[PDB]
């Protein structure tokens, strides 16, 4: 598998807080017109080929609901990860699907050499929180050619998502009042195709700002999810497939063997 990166995997690798690639970044003031900024975080080493690469959206203005911590955490494993300012304020979920896409884009056809330089075009992922998790679920159906979705406590009022054909894996938080799983997160989950590679990770006694704080169980199974579709590294297989037990975990459902 020519996307293989990094040493192989262990239980303490996929939790460890800085993987095994250094990490650059760059700040970009505006990645798409009317849409702000973001920074991109990448692995300074290039030895072992170009990454792909994953846009990661917030859903609130308020300084809380910041995906900075995703940026060293997951570049560090091998990715490049551009993750979207809390500056701009978006209030649909379609226009986070939309961000989320010129975010892509900006790192494909606009950034600057040392990101371009070190980046695979055709692979590509989003992710976001709640209507940017919402917006993760649209990007898919905006672009099937997306290699990976994480809608981390997604907010969206269509529930229906038959149509995704990008393996999906949503993050819900138990006690969550903002995006109750019982009406996003699970029916989302639930609509996807039983064909489709997906998984639906709910985290015990977590609310809806517990993607915003680092969090092991998060950060292990974004990394596997990642690497598994991303670049298609049967490697971190084991720890998607069968179900994950972390004892932070309420209920784990997936159409697992992949």
Sequence with gaps: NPYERGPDPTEDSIEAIRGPFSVATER??????????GTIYYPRETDEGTFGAVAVAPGFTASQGSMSWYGERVASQGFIVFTIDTNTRLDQPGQRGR?????????????????????????????????????????????????????????????????????????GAELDTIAPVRTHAKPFYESLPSSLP???????????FAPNIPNTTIAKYVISWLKRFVDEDTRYSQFLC?????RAIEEYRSTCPY
């Design 28 to 37: 970009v003031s505006s990645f798409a017109s009317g849409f702000g900024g």
């Design 99 to 171: 961000q989320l896409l010129a975010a892509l884009d900006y790192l494909v056809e606009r950034s600057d050499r040392k990101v371009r330089e070190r980046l695979d075009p055709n692979r590509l992922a989003v992710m976001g929180h709640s209507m940017g998790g919402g917006g993760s679920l649209e990007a898919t159906v905006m672009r099937p050619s997306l290699k990976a979705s994480i809608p981390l406590t997604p907010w969206n009022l269509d529930k229906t998502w038959g149509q995704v054909q990008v393996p999906t894996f949503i993050i």
């Design 198 to 208: 997906k998984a639906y990770m709910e985290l015990d006694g977590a609310t809806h």
């Design 242 to 246: 069968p179900n994950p037990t972390d």
